[PDB]
Amino acid sequence: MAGILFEDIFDVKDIDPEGKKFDRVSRLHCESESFKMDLILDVNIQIYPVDLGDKFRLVIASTLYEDGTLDDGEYNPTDDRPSRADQFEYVMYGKVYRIEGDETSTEAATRLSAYVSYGGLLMRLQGDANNLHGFEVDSRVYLLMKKLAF
Amino acid sequence: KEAIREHQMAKTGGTQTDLFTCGKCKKKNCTYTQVQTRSADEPMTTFVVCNECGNRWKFC
């Protein structure tokens, strides 16, 4: 029942990816309110006009119709199930493409890092154990954000 | 003895560009080529060769 993969409220560190940026897409840099975990993500600024230092709510779910399987692709527009993390302002579908860590130090694996891709859109999440339950997988995760310009 | 010693010094040429790094020796001791004015379907490329440790690669 709605076994959410991740949920947190994030703060914008930067909206200017190394200055040069791009036109329809821009890379945001964020950090979690725990201030122990940080995030960088490519976004469509045209459909979601971000401001710097903004307070965002971020949620991640590998599934919708609750917890049951759906990793298919009949973009069934006609679904009517309220099992939709839809009330959030911004949603994306993607894969995890890379995982970082460091287990050579002995058990370590200290400061685990996850990298994620939503249709090519790169993402980086850093954290000791926040990603201890996740790993790199084919496209399945849904990323939902709200609280824009709170 | 100096002047006859000087007669080897440079030899007769020079080049070097020192722009591209070489992953075999970190030093940018590289040479560059301007070739393929027209050629066939292959795109005109700039070829870079590292003198030391012999490395050659392309702009592409």
Binding site: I99, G101, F135 | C53, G54
Partner: protein
């Protein structure tokens, strides 16, 4: 083999054209078998030998 190989290539270039790119083949097995660095690597080394 490593000791022999120094004789064969005085140029020290290890990049040669050869048949069957095992790396791509081995990699494909990983893409197929779904092996990952956060999964155990159960192996019998003699079988490899």
């Amino acid at each position: 083999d490593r000791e022999v190989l120094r004789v064969i290539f005085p140029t020290g270039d290890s990049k040669v054209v050869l048949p069957c790119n095992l790396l791509r083949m081995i990699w494909n097995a990983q893409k197929i078998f779904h092996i990952n660095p956060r999964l155990p690597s159960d192996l019998h080394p003699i079988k490899v030998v």
